[model samples]
Target: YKSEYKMSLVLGPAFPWGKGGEIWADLVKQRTNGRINIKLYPGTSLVAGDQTREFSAIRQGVIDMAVGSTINWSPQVRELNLFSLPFLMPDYKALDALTQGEVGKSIFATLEKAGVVPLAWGENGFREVSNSKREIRKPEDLKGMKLRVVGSPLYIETFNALGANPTQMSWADAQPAMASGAVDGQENPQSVFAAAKLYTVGQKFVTTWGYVADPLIFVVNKQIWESWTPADREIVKQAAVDAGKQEIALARKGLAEPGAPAWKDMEAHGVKVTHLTPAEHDAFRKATAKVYDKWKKQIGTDLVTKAEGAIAKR
Candidate 1:
């Protein structure tokens, strides 16, 4: 490794403990033995509105690395959404099998071909509907409600298909938008909503649609990686993978069996929560099945089948 070589990291959405980006950075610092200095830039301080821009910024050498949703890069790399299909993984065990198995390798190969190097697969858990006005127990309940979504096409399409009016807005813009009546509801992980204080905005109902489990990728510029020495490259890769493992474990544990602290947090904030029963799950799945098929054509059916197969095996 060259003495002059350094690193810059950007974590999405700026929540402190969500997905463990801080731990990832800390692990890297400890492993490098103070040889590599990494400057951690939390949240969208550099690029605020659309997270998709993070890819171009990294490619242009404006930023060295960024941890963000694969959906953000779907415009540039369509297959990245294969893992993001609504209700795809079902649970953490299935998600782990698909991402750590052969399907994940193939997807990473596709990303590399698109000029981005995906270092590791992290988690954003399942995104549920947080509504200020009404409870979203089923697709019919979502009618006429304005929902704020990321700039990703899949989110807009999925929400619209399920009968909700969807708007593309950044998380940074959410609080103000909600305050001004631009949107009635927004979807995000539990930790994210709590950290951003979205729960304080009169959103009482938390519908566990569990639509998409946001799979994040710590991506770097292909050119930047090709310039690295093997030793430094290995160090960075090891740090990323180790961090990913920890993040996945944490996400799974939280969702599978939400501990007392998390429950208390939600209760203290006065957020009413509901999970999908077996009947409700079927209804939600049937309502949005067409959107999955539409995206399947774009993401390749074979890849989807491969991931489903991997999940089933485990």
Candidate 2:
């Protein structure tokens, strides 16, 4: 095995995504007896902060491994769009039903076809909408809002369907854009909103509508996977599984309870937390229904059907 393996992340150590990478690296080092070493390059620096290019870079050996977001990789591997589907998985149970069931296995197979080895699944939590302006209670509230989103066509389509102007940018650029009023709002997990202190950057109003959840995928380059002995490979893979389980708990820590601590933290910082009424959330769902339909076919009708079945079962 190489002396050091490079792992890429879109957020730094302060966020759940980065912590997933850190836990995996630490576990692999301990389990492999230092035979394998992993280093993290956060903020997508390995790919010059172009997250959509991360999967391709890993395939070409530009990156050795990555704990990447499914949304970021959806452009390269369309199957990943299952997670990005607007309002698809409504709760952690639904998300788990997809990732821990047959659908998850199918995705790993697709990743293998795309030239990377999928190791394990972790959570980025349910993404919530936040803005510098007023609370968002209805679809109309989002109209004409300049929202910052990940550089993915589906996300752009989702926001556009809701009548918002979605601007695509990396996290680094998005921060400055939000601070300067270039971007009015953004969507992410509450964990991220607190970790990155988005409220301080002028994102004072947050609506926990649970629009979508971003699942973190631990992957290794095909060549890098082949370089390790079978025993060492199993060790590395098991380490990822262990790390993923722990990271998911960390990601959902405060937000799983009634009156979530994360929300309290945001409120203490003078950020207004808005939990939409069932009727209000339904409005956003109805508005984005067209996006979901269009992308279901684009993402493969068969795959989406299977996912729906899983979510229903949950």
Candidate 3:
């Protein structure tokens, strides 16, 4: 391998997504006897925090690898938008069904064609909405609220459909935006909300709408990947697979298998967590139906249909 492979991450090591990269880098070094070395550049420092550019930078060899968000890459690789579809996978089972089944394989093929080598999948957990205002029980509550969202067109479309003003910004900039009340709300996983201490920024109200799950993909630049010998390539791939499974478990640690420790942790810190009823969740689904239909064509109907089948069988 080269002197060291550069791995880009949108969040710092404090977040679960960043932890995944740390784990992969550690495992590869330990397992490969130091033949392959990986150094993580979190907060997208390698690309100046412009997450949407991470994939392209990696492809062009400006960056060597990344643990990228599906939503952030959707603009370049449309098939990845499948994971960003609002309320698409209602639970972990449905999510696993897609990533562990045919849909996962097809997306990997698409990613390969898009000029990167996808190694494995990790979780970003279910993204939830939080605000400084009131409990968001339905779409109506979001009317005219300025929400900070990742710089993804579909997310902007989703929030706009629900009657909110969506602003796209990097996480580094978002912290200050929320701190100064420049943005009324933001959506992210509870893990992120807690790790980043969003409540300290006045994100006092949280809604566990489970709107979407942003699964992380471990990928390597094509040329960087080709530079490795077949044996080293397999070693790196196996290390990623091992790290991805452990990282997914870590991401879901306090939230999965009952008890809701993550929620309790948030409440102990004085954040109000609201879980939506089926009817309430349906109101959101209905509100964003147009955005879904619009993105389905852009994401490819056949792929979306296959994803639906995978989720149904789950």
Candidate 4:
């Protein structure tokens, strides 16, 4: 049962089923008039224990494309961390402006130079702190608590800079790390914490610390992409861009709808949600500013400066 076109997308972790993954699939199929067929290989299923291998797999054409985090790709494409670095961009709107502006073109240009192509940017929204034991209101509260950071170095550095005892580990390792008390807590998007059923393992409190947007980047293998006809390339890129835009809108909508079951579902399971005031969020940003300076050389100050200029224009 082959369609007129065949392609695949690798998704990170288990699809929330309702979030962007399902929406993306439906939009692509409809937009391409069923000419483009996409097979989803959820990220954790493909790589198992070594989730960081997503980039190399896509690069080697082992996977057609992947919707993955900048943190996951940071090890290989260090500059992609420009989006993930703590407090780098202001908020989701600011982040979207940068990605939609010339700054995004510059960043994607950097990815293209590395033999990959960024089709569109998706959102994981802002990662907040969730813990079973206590609420994390400030940097001091994080001190002495073992927290799970992503395998990316900057995430660990960012947490460490804020005074937490941080462990850099993959999501595959995080559950057991929590079970064994190797990590008492971890930070993730509120939806992710809910989807993963982390609340069952004692995620009792959520701090809307809003540090980083775990951006889901849609990237394809350069060689495989170049093999497509011009019209097919346009179809693929348009399908992704369209779907990505829809996903961003849907995700923000999910966060806003009060009676929405997504929020109710999480609260029903006993996870106390905390929404930060603007002042509280600013304080978190101020405390983590060091992460920006620390990674400036690695992320290239020129790029950051350009990104800021781009945002200023918006």
Candidate 5:
């Protein structure tokens, strides 16, 4: 185990995204009797807040490990867009069928070829739409809305399909651009909306459309992975799996599990929180089919078919 392991994340303990890295560090320390010590660089500090750079940075050993977003890493691993596809993951159960099932095994294999030893999977929750302009019950409501997005080009194309003006920027600039009214809105998990107090930033309307889920990839630099003893590797991997489980519970609080206190709290602050009925969701589903089909070829027909079949089984 390295005396100093560097883990990078975009958000910290104020949100669930950071909790997995925190809990994983604590668990590894105890299980290994302090053999491994990790220091976290939240806000993507190590990469200077560039989430897209973290994955390749980890491969180069600048970052030892990360619970990086699949959406962020999609540029490097195109197959990761499997999750980024709009409305691909209908529920947490469908998300699991990909990460815990055959599709996941193939993705981990893809990451290995990309110079990392992928260990476990965690949740970043679904990217839901929120903006100040108006309530978005239908796709056309988002027309001309400037949405701040990061990590993948597909996002630009995704929002563009809605006729939204998508702005690509780092997460560091998200709130500032939003508060300055330079951008109308952004889409992220409710945990982010609540943690950042986006309601105060003119994000007065949120729609839980469950557009796409971002699964957190727990991975270590291949060079670092080679340094660990087989037994130590097992311990570290187990810790990540356990921490990922806890992180999922926290990330799923708003929409998946009961007690969606996020919506209640946001509404208390005068934000309009919207949930889509099944029929309402299919509207956007049909709208984005163009982008979806374009990327289905990019993400590989076989893999997407496999994912669709997995979700169908559930």
Candidate 6:
């Protein structure tokens, strides 16, 4: 049965979840030196037609492994519904704390106790990033906000367009680099910055401004899990863990949130995110009312917060 394990995914390689699944499949094969090979089945293909079938399909026979939404299976298992709760997560900090702290264990225990075996977890949804530098609402905040990038004159000029103090760095260095304050605001999809990756880097106080998303499970069908040798199982689980991380980071790539748009690509590393909205949208350009034409005078284009106290005040 391990000849080519069937992995289920609702998305194709274009999305983060799909990419993560591919990573796991490929990771498993490498770890085994060809002893194990995993195949991907998108659209949750194991089930005939219903989104509802993934859990049951895996439990029964067709599907072997999956990176799937907890809510879809919540009807079968209750622990999952917790994330489905209304507006509870807000940002990756809370999501990280709950899953990494306690609730995660309970959820895992629930899954394993059921007919399936749980391994790693995955993330969904897309928003933007935050600033550890200031209360990011409009460009007035930019007068004080420090933006990071693998910079060029254009980014700085565009950033300068809003009164921001923009700086450039390698994408690699820029990550924890923001931690040291060379720059503190970012725009990647929030999922990439999962678990307050940058927030803690900047200082503290995560905001619920990013209350968007759900948690998904990384699991294998119980029978199939039991079929693998213990050594193979060990490597598979570890691969799943790596896949989870990769998925979070990669998911931000295409920005496939249900209704959206990237920030979590660093979740694999760590960073916090603060989402901006209409309430804070308008005054921004106004904050730099005089900065626009200057950009036309030069070149082109685009791109904070105390967070919590700021989050609550809203």
Q: Which one is best on lDDT?
A: 2
lDDT of 5: 0.89
Estimate, for each residue in 203-243, the C-alpha lDDT of model 3 and write its tens digit.
99999898899888999999999999888889889988988
Flag the better candidate by lDDT, 4 or 5.
5
10 residues in a row with least lDDT, candidate 5: 253-262
List lDDT for all candidates, in order. Answer: 0.73, 0.90, 0.89, 0.71, 0.89, 0.60
Please give, for residues 99-205, the per-residue lDDT of candidate 4 as tens digits: 78877788789888888888888777777787667777777778877888878888888888778888887777888887776778888865677668888777777
Candidate 2 colliding pairs, count: 0
Q: Model 2, range 1-314, lDDT digits (tens) per residue? A: 67788999998779878888898999999988888988899989998989888989999999999998999898899989989888888788999999999999999999998889999999888999999989899988899999999888999999998889999988888989998999999999988988988998899999998989989999999999998898988998998998899889989988877778888888999999898889998889999999999999998899999999999988
Give the TM-score (vs. native) of candidate 6: 0.56
Q: Which RMSD values do the candidates have, in order?
A: 2.6, 0.9, 1.0, 3.4, 1.3, 16.1
What's each prediction's TM-score?
0.90, 0.98, 0.98, 0.86, 0.97, 0.56
What's the lDDT of the predicted structure labeled candidate 6? 0.60
lDDT of each residue in 87-137, candidate 1, tens digit only: 787776787787789888998888778777889988776787888887777
Off by over 4 Å in 2: none
Candidate 1 TM-score, true structure as reference: 0.90
The per-residue C-alpha lDDT of model 4 at residue 275 equals: 66
TM-score, structure 2 vs. true: 0.98
Runs in model 1 deviating more than 4 A are 1-19, 258-264
Winner on TM-score (2 vs 4) = 2
Q: Which ten residues in a row have the lowest lDDT in candidate 3?
A: 253-262
Put down candidate 6 lDDT per residue, 259-303, tens digits, no spaces. Answer: 333333433334333445756644543443344344333321210
